[PDB]
């Protein structure tokens, strides 16, 4: 079964992951694409493209806060709000991955610590087109130009994510494909400081086989889609590397700012 899977076991795993993904993540790629192409009967997202539209739109986006800081800082605080919720979502999803909760609890923590931001940037692509990103569960649309234009170094958090996303979105994955791919990323046996790699690699083996079958079935025309996708896993680590360097700059150059305790915990002694 989980030890020696045949096709039907792998399909069952794919479906289990798809169902828990639907349960864990409020906004799917399906719903996002419907929003981004106008093919839906909900009201359009509020478009945020400059300081004035941010001001006009802060009304319409789920963002809880105490209170006026500059625009770049306010966007960054927003990103912390969303990132914390995303980490919660991903943690709930990880618990649904067969075998994950049976791992040493310290290894569960290490896999999340390293995996969550990689998953955030992967799933961010689902909310993006080349001109901007859906925010606050599709209620808002923040333009790429606006985000790119934020004063240094805040703009540099943004544009690398878009650049990754347009290339990643060229693969045309759906939610059923992504549900397995994100599980694969979480179950990475090479994270620093793992205590017991073998049961993590056992789970990842099965996930990778499940992903490969899913891609062959769901994208029969898309030859070697499994292989291109695997190469994106190293790209995601580079996004993290660059991102952490910018956070380190911010920590020093912006004294009033401090990360949410969850995010401090994730970044503390990362690598």
């Amino acid at each position: 079964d989980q030890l020696n899977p045949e096709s039907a076991d792998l399909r069952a795993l794919a479906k289990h992951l798809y169902d828990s993904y639907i349960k864990s993540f409020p906004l799917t790629k399906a719903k996002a694409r419907a929003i981004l192409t106008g093919k839906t009967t909900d009201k359009s997202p509020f478009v945020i493209y400059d300081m004035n539209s941010l001001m006009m739109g802060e009304d319409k986006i789920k963002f809880k806060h105490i209170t006026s800081k500059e625009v770049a800082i306010r966007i960054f605080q927003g990103c912390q709000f969303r990132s914390v919720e995303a980490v919660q979502e991903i943690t709930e999803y990880a618990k649904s991955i067969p075998g994950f909760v049976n791992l040493d609890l310290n290894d569960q923590v290490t896999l999340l610590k390293y995996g969550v931001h990689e998953i955030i940037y992967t799933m961010l692509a689902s909310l993006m087109n080349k001109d901007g990103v859906l925010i606050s569960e599709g209620q808002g649309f923040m333009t790429r130009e606006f985000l790119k234009s934020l004063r240094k170094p805040f703009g540099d958090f943004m544009e690398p994510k878009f650049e990754f996303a347009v290339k990643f979105n060229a693969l045309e994955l759906d939610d059923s494909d992504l549900a397995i791919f994100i599980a694969v990323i979480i179950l990475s046996g090479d994270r620093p400081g793992l205590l017991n790699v073998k049961p993590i690699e056992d789970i990842q083996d099965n996930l990778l086989q499940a992903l490969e079958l899913q891609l062959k079935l769901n994208h029969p025309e898309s030859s070697q889609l499994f292989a291109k996708l695997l190469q994106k896993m190293t790209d995601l680590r580079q996004i993290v590397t660059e991102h952490v360097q910018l956070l380190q700059v911010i920590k020093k150059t912006e004294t009033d700012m401090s990360l949410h305790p969850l995010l401090q915990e994730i970044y503390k002694d990362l690598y």
Binding site: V87, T91, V101, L105, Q108, V109, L112, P261, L262, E265
Partner: peptide, 10 residues
């Protein structure tokens, strides 16, 4: 990793 542990527990 206090908060992550808490999230994993529930």
């Amino acid at each position: 990793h206090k908060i992550l542990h808490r999230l994993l527990q529930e």
